Design a protein around this ligand. Structure first.
Ligand SMILES: *[C@@H]1O[C@H](CO)[C@@H](O[C@@H]2O[C@H](CO)[C@@H](O[C@@H]3O[C@H](CO[C@H]4O[C@H](CO)[C@@H](O)[C@H](O)[C@@H]4O)[C@@H](O)[C@H](O)[C@@H]3O)[C@H](O)[C@H]2NC(C)=O)[C@H](O)[C@H]1NC(C)=O
Ligand SMILES: *[C@@H]1O[C@H](CO)[C@@H](O[C@@H]2O[C@H](CO)[C@@H](O[C@@H]3O[C@H](CO)[C@@H](O)[C@H](O)[C@@H]3O)[C@H](O)[C@H]2NC(C)=O)[C@H](O)[C@H]1NC(C)=O
Ligand SMILES: *[C@@H]1O[C@H](CO)[C@@H](O[C@@H]2O[C@H](CO)[C@@H](O[C@@H]3O[C@H](CO)[C@@H](O)[C@H](O)[C@@H]3O)[C@H](O)[C@H]2NC(C)=O)[C@H](O)[C@H]1NC(C)=O
Ligand SMILES: *[C@@H]1O[C@H](CO)[C@@H](O[C@@H]2O[C@H](CO)[C@@H](O[C@@H]3O[C@H](CO)[C@@H](O)[C@H](O)[C@@H]3O)[C@H](O)[C@H]2NC(C)=O)[C@H](O)[C@H]1NC(C)=O
Ligand SMILES: *[C@@H]1O[C@H](CO)[C@@H](O[C@@H]2O[C@H](CO)[C@@H](O[C@@H]3O[C@H](CO)[C@@H](O)[C@H](O)[C@@H]3O)[C@H](O)[C@H]2NC(C)=O)[C@H](O)[C@H]1NC(C)=O
Ligand SMILES: *[C@@H]1O[C@H](CO[C@@H]2O[C@@H](C)[C@@H](O)[C@@H](O)[C@@H]2O)[C@@H](O[C@@H]2O[C@H](CO)[C@@H](O)[C@H](O)[C@H]2NC(C)=O)[C@H](O)[C@H]1NC(C)=O
Ligand SMILES: *[C@@H]1O[C@H](CO)[C@@H](O[C@@H]2O[C@H](CO)[C@@H](O)[C@H](O)[C@H]2NC(C)=O)[C@H](O)[C@H]1NC(C)=O
Ligand SMILES: *[C@@H]1O[C@H](CO)[C@@H](O[C@@H]2O[C@H](CO)[C@@H](O)[C@H](O)[C@H]2NC(C)=O)[C@H](O)[C@H]1NC(C)=O
Ligand code: NAG
Ligand code: NAG
Ligand code: NAG
Ligand code: NAG
Ligand code: NAG
Ligand code: NAG
Ligand code: NAG
Lengths: 261, 313, 389, 97, 49
């Protein structure tokens, strides 16, 4: 994969306090500046969909359309022995439901709808086998972020950051408009706390779900980056309204260190 | 209040130590009185408050840039206004000063008017009038130069003085690093108070920094243990802050004494001490009032163009 | 001062503070309630050996109805009490439903004799879970009899706790004492296993403003005066902090409004008095305190003179000018004068003078006086040595 | 009253308190001594410059024009008697340069 | 370093005492600068050798 470097992405509100025109200093998990991040090829011949470790967070971003990435899979064993999180989605609302679902060794949908011959086809729908065991469930507020049609242009940046501590699985995200179809243009934008889950389970590995049959296939134009988080000290600049506007990593270079000091 | 805000148990526990609060209050009261003593000593040096005459016929000199302007609602001079522009929620109070800025301005104006109208006589006894040209001649004779020099270069000297005050005013208006001392004093005081307030968020080894939280969480033995730990920490912080204040007060008192001596020896007369009242040969000086401080304008005479000669004893 | 005589001057005394009027509590009024009605209105319970276990979360486990309900007759909590259950939270509660013999109420006690206890369902000896027993004979009794709940599980081999006779003639409403079926609700809770998510409801009180009161929003306690504010919080933001890291604005859980917090007024107190020789009349000063609010509640008073330094009582304001006698602050001094009383005025800086300056006039003295003055300077202070040990 | 072992806790508390009191007292004394030393230096300078000779500095040795001074002892300090000459009675005239 | 140099455990424990170390460092730095100012102002009085 191509090791692109994030310039200023991966900053989220660490708490729920209001501050105005204050340069607060915080010590929490963060994505370091200018850290190279993998650029996977979100293709179905060639099938790239491996299981990636979950180490104290994941900066997920993409530019898909019409909800190509249906959902995520989290767990530690993924063998029905431990309850795993499922965030499959479609049509009306989000259908979050965490249970010990029977995981197939190759549980992928992989369907060409409106790809070459402009037709919605679903060759198989065996993604589900049986819900042998279940112990919890929680559907959040019925919703669906802007993951609808965008063929007109990739004028979207669905930034996501996940994190799990003290039995709480938090999810931050937002809609960031983009203007250039080229690689991630430089810019600044803060992440808001979108949803919090008191699931109280264990996650060590996670797997993503992709819907982008083999007939006349060519490597598709889709990708998603996956960074990692480290404990670092940041300085955050609050504006009049209480929305952060800038930040400087205190463990990057001497001038940044002096700024922090 | 600061140590045990709204906690009867905490107050009872602090009763063991006891007189620490009284000692701290006594020390701070001493400092507070000393401040007013400093200001009084430095500024109040005139029995009567003189006032300048209506007509400013000072032999060609021009003091309009420093004398009070009645038109402004605040009776302060141009330079004083320039300087002024250039420069309770946790049991901490700030007491207002005894003398207000209006009184300070009145004192300074009285001093300046007495000077420009009577030389140095008013510093020794009753004020006596004397034309400004005569006063300049006396000063020149003082520094070792005959009078005819002044009586023949009056116009040139007046023009040079006016240009000098123009340049000083412009420099003050433009630059911003001239008031480093006063800015530093204010910043240091604010920083000390901020740190003292910030010290209340530390655990000091206790489980939590919220007294009510500890009380509602733990039972009555570890509860009082934690309370004792917090009391010790906060007491130490208070003592350190008080000691710092004492040292800073001593420094400021030394500076105030120096300023009072400068006022008495330069403004009220003429000094032969080298480099005391400005560089060169001293002639006179004018005071001005600034926030938490004073400012002087030393006037001096400096030779410019030299020659060569052959000498015999 | 620890003395019977006080010299002329101004002296410090006790501190002054305003007590809170009352207490106020606000919480996000509950709309999510667990389906206890359907839980305890089940038409028919499951098998005893297949007792259900429903984990309860994302819903308030209200218990007021239990207290309000008069149907329940026996209700014992051996680990907690209802009084402290209001401020006590349980991580999670499992609703376990089973059918047991009416006479087994005595044997259900944890750590009690009777092998039937562990033959049907063993209970840990330290089971402090509260047991609710309200008569439901008619509700859970059939005309013919409930023969499904066979109790022939008399296997000789004992069953270990969670290792992985037919004395019932029929449950009928005509059952005698000790044989009628009773509905059993098991209060099972644990600690240090998952974050607390189930708690009893907390009441709320009407909001108040412009009163020094004690408040508690979402566990945030303090004392202050609540007021409307124009601050624009973010949708996901709750509190507000200052540069000093002190709370200064909160959002009401019920009404999404931002309210400011300002500490209740306080300040020092001082006493102004001339020497005990001249008289004993005094006047008190309240440092930095609003003056026209304290007298609303020297009982007569009749002398209140607002000043920048704070409210002043006992002295009359005269608009003359004299030299400072007992300094107060902000260019105000007080002194004793005659009709003897204390007065407060504005200090005078000195007598006005105007020099008759001209441009051809000079004044010369005619003769002189020789004056003698003193000056006192400390030189040293007494020695002292101390033996530390 | 107590046995050897337990009494150590009480002894430690008392020792800590008394040690704090001593440290505070010593610090106060040090600062006071510094101030008094400054005053003593000023007094010595006044003695040297006024008693042993005439001073041209204004307001240093007395108010007005200085003539001469005398020292006098006192408990833990010294006292001066400055003698000064002060013009008294003024009469006005007309002047030219 | 002086208090418990080279011990992460004691570093973490000392983190709970506030800003004492910062205050001490500030004071010592102030004195250090003051020394140089003293020497400079006492000696460098003529800007021409
Ligand atoms: C003594 O020096 C003062 C400094 O200038 C003189 O005050 C002003 O000087 C100006 C020019 O010399 C006079 O002429 C006009 O001034 C007005 C505005 O007045 C301001 O003038 C200067 C410059 O703007 C300013 O620094 C003063 O503070 C005044 O506020 C302008 O339209 C022009 O500059 C114009 O030249 C002013 O009449 C005079 N204004 C005063 C005293 O308010 C003063 O004239 C000198 N005294 C004399 C010559 O007897
Ligand atoms: C909150 O953020 C804004 C900007 O960061 C601060 O000023 C705000 O600027 C916008 C610009 O449009 C103002 O919108 C209004 O637009 C209408 C026309 O549509 C115009 O007539 C108004 O004069 C105004 O420009 C907005 O009113 C203005 N205030 C706010 C709250 O957005 C603002 O100071 C910040 N407020 C706080 C509490 O931080
Ligand atoms: C908990 O308390 C909040 C109030 O903080 C409740 O919301 C409030 O409910 C009342 C009653 O509906 C609203 O006042 C009236 O509402 C009717 C609704 O049709 C309207 O026609 C009237 O004109 C009047 O506005 C009030 O607007 C509303 N305010 C807020 C901030 O919610 C809430 O219903 C209660 N339950 C919760 C929060 O779960
Ligand atoms: C002291 O003050 C004035 C001001 O400079 C100097 O002489 C003064 O000059 C004016 C103009 O001559 C005199 O005003 C009047 O002028 C009209 C012109 O028509 C004339 O008819 C009057 O007789 C009168 O001169 C003013 O009176 C006059 N004042 C004085 C005191 O002389 C004077 O030279 C200055 N002298 C010194 C030592 O400073
Ligand atoms: C010489 O100096 C004396 C010192 O003042 C002046 O003689 C007369 O002195 C008074 C002020 O002491 C001048 O004002 C007169 O007394 C007061 C204060 O000014 C007030 O009642 C009036 O303003 C009254 O005019 C007075 O003008 C002055 N008499 C004169 C000039 O004839 C005077 O300044 C100088 N002239 C003489 C002859 O002494
Ligand atoms: C005053 O004198 C020195 C040198 O002495 C005299 O300088 C001339 C003015 C004249 O009086 C000669 O007879 C003397 O030599 C001046 O400095 C000298 O200037 C010139 C060229 O630089 C030359 O004499 C020497 O190089 C200089 N002196 C040295 C190198 O020691 C000085 O400039 C004179 N002051 C003024 C204002 O002219
Ligand atoms: C479940 O059944 C009970 C019946 O007890 C309902 O609560 C009330 O019970 C008392 C008994 O005196 C009544 O008189 C009320 O009529 C009952 N309330 C009703 C019928 O609404 C309880 O409401 C039921 N819960 C449900 C259906 O969810
Ligand atoms: C100025 O001169 C007069 C003239 O003597 C002095 O007036 C006398 O002063 C003495 C003081 O010892 C008195 O005894 C006389 O009664 C005064 N009147 C006379 C002698 O006629 C006056 O003291 C001198 N004043 C000053 C300030 O020098
Ligand atoms: C990330 O890996 C690529 C691969 O060469 C490298 O070029 C880049 O410098 C790396 N980024 C950082 C911050 O080291
Ligand atoms: C998503 O797919 C399946 C149904 O095919 C299930 O998870 C759920 O019903 C669907 N989501 C919604 C909102 O219907
Ligand atoms: C061609 O069109 C048919 C009809 O919908 C569709 O089944 C098939 O997948 C299309 N072929 C490709 C390569 O998309
Ligand atoms: C998963 O395993 C068993 C299956 O009977 C049972 O405990 C339940 O279905 C699940 N575990 C729980 C709810 O703890
Ligand atoms: C994984 O998560 C569980 C909590 O569900 C907790 O016991 C621990 O963090 C991990 N499990 C074990 C046996 O360590
Ligand atoms: C009263 O006056 C004198 C002498 O001036 C003083 O000695 C005495 O202490 C005073 N007594 C009181 C009670 O003020
Ligand atoms: C003094 O001046 C007037 C006289 O009527 C009036 O304001 C009042 O009596 C006095 N001033 C004040 C502030 O009391």
């Amino acid at each position: 994969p191509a090791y692109t470097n994030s310039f200023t992405r991966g900053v989220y509100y660490p708490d729920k306090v209001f501050r105005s025109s204050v340069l607060h200093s915080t010590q929490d998990l963060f994505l370091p500046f200018f850290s190279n991040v993998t650029w996977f090829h979100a293709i179905h011949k060639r099938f790239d969909n491996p299981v990636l470790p979950f180490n104290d967070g994941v900066y997920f971003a993409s530019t898909e359309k019409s909800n190509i990435i249906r959902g995520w899979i989290f767990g530690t064993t993924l063998d029905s022995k431990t309850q795993s999180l499922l965030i499959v989605n479609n049509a009306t609302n989000v259908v979050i439901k965490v249970c010990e679902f029977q995981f197939c060794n190759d549980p992928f949908l992989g369907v060409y709808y409106h790809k070459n011959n402009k037709s919605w086809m679903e060759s198989e729908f065996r993604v589900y086998s049986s819900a042998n065991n279940c112990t919890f469930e929680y559907v959040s507020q019925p919703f669906l972020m802007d993951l609808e049609g965008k063929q007109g242009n990739f004028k979207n940046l669905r930034e996501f950051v996940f994190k799990n501590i003290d039995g709480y699985f938090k999810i931050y995200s937002k809609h960031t408009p983009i203007n250039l179809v080229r690689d991630l243009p430089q810019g600044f934008s803060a992440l808001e706390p979108l949803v919090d889950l008191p699931i109280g389970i264990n996650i060590t590995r996670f797997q993503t779900l992709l819907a982008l049959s083999s007939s006349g296939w060519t490597a598709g134009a889709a990708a998603y980056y996956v960074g990692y988080l480290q404990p670092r000290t940041f300085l955050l600049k609050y504006n009049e309204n209480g929305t952060i506007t800038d930040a400087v990593d205190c463990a990057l270079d001497p001038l940044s260190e002096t700024k922090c000091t | 209040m600061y140590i045990c805000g709204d906690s009867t148990e905490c107050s009872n526990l602090l009763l063991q130590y006891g007189s620490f609060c009284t000692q701290l209050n006594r020390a701070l009261t001493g400092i507070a009185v000393e401040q007013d003593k400093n200001t009084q000593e430095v500024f109040a040096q005139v029995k009567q408050i003189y006032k300048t005459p209506p007509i400013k016929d000072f032999g060609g000199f021009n003091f309009s840039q420093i004398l009070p302007d009645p038109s402004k609602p605040s009776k302060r001079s141009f330079i004083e206004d320039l300087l002024f522009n250039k420069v309770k929620f946790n049991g901490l109070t700030v007491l207002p000063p005894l003398l207000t800025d209006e009184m300070i301005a009145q004192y300074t104006s009285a001093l300046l008017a007495g000077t420009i109208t009577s030389g140095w006589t008013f510093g020794a006894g009753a004020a006596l009038q004397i034309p400004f040209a005569m006063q300049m001649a006396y000063r020149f004779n003082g520094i070792g130069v005959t009078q005819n020099v002044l009586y023949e270069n009056q116009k040139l000297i007046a023009n040079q003085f006016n240009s000098a005050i123009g340049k000083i005013q412009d420099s003050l208006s433009s630059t911003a690093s001239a008031l480093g001392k006063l800015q530093d004093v204010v910043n240091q005081n604010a920083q000390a108070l901020n740190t003292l307030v910030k010290q209340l968020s530390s655990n000091f080894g206790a489980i939590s920094s919220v007294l009510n939280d500890i009380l509602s969480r733990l039972d009555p033995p570890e509860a009082e243990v934690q309370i004792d730990r917090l009391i010790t920490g906060r007491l130490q912080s208070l003592q350190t802050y008080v000691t710092q204040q004492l040292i800073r007060a001593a420094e400021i008192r030394a500076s105030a004494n120096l300023a009072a001596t400068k006022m008495s020896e330069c403004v009220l007369g003429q000094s032969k001490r080298v480099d005391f009242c400005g560089k060169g040969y001293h002639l006179m000086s004018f005071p001005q009032s600034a926030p938490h401080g004073v400012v002087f304008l030393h006037v001096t005479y400096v030779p410019a163009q030299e020659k060569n000669f052959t000498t015999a004893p | 001062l620890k003395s019977f005589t006080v010299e002329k001057g101004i002296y410090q005394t006790s501190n002054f503070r305003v007590q809170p009027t009352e207490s106020i509590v606000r919480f996000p009024n509950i709309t999510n309630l667990c389906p206890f009605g359907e839980v305890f209105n089940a038409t028919r319970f499951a098998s005893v050996y297949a007792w259900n276990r429903k984990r309860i979360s994302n819903c308030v486990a209200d218990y007021s109805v239990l207290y309000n309900s008069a149907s329940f007759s026996t209700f014992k909590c051996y680990g907690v009490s209802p009084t402290k259950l209001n401020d006590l939270c349980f991580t999670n509660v499992y609703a376990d439903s089973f059918v047991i013999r009416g006479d087994e109420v005595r044997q259900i006690a944890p750590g009690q004799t009777g092998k039937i206890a562990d033959y049907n369902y063993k209970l840990p000896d330290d089971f402090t879970g509260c047991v609710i027993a309200w008569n439901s004979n008619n509700l859970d009794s059939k005309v013919g009899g409930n023969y499904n709940y066979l109790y022939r599980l008399f296997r000789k081999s004992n069953l270990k706790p969670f290792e992985r006779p037919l004395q019932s003639y029929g449950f009928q409403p005509t059952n005698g004492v000790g044989y009628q079926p009773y509905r059993v609700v098991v209060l099972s809770f644990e600690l240090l296993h998952a974050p607390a998510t189930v708690c009893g409801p907390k009441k709320s009180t009407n909001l108040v403003k412009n009163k020094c009161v004690n408040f508690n929003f979402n566990g945030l306690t303090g004392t202050g005066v609540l007021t409307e504010s124009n601050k624009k919080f973010l949708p996901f933001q709750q509190f507000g902090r200052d540069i000093a890291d002190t709370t200064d604005a909160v959002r009401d859980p019920q009404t999404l409004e931002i309210l400011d917090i300002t500490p209740c007024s306080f300040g020092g107190v001082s006493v102004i008095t001339p020497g005990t020789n001249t008289s004993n009349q005094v006047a008190v000063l309240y440092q930095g305190v609003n003056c026209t609010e304290v007298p609303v509640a020297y009982s007569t008073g009749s002398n209140v003179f607002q000043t920048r330094a704070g409210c002043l009582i006992g002295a009359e304001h005269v608009n003359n000018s004299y030299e400072c006698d007992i300094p107060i602050g902000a260019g105000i001094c007080a002194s004793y004068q005659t009709s003897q009383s204390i007065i407060a005025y504005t200090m005078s800086l000195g007598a006005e003078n105007s020099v008759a300056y001209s441009n051809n006039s000079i004044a010369i003295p005619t003769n002189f006086t020789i004056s003698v003055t003193t000056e006192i300077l400390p030189v040293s202070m007494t020695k002292t040595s101390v033996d530390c040990t």
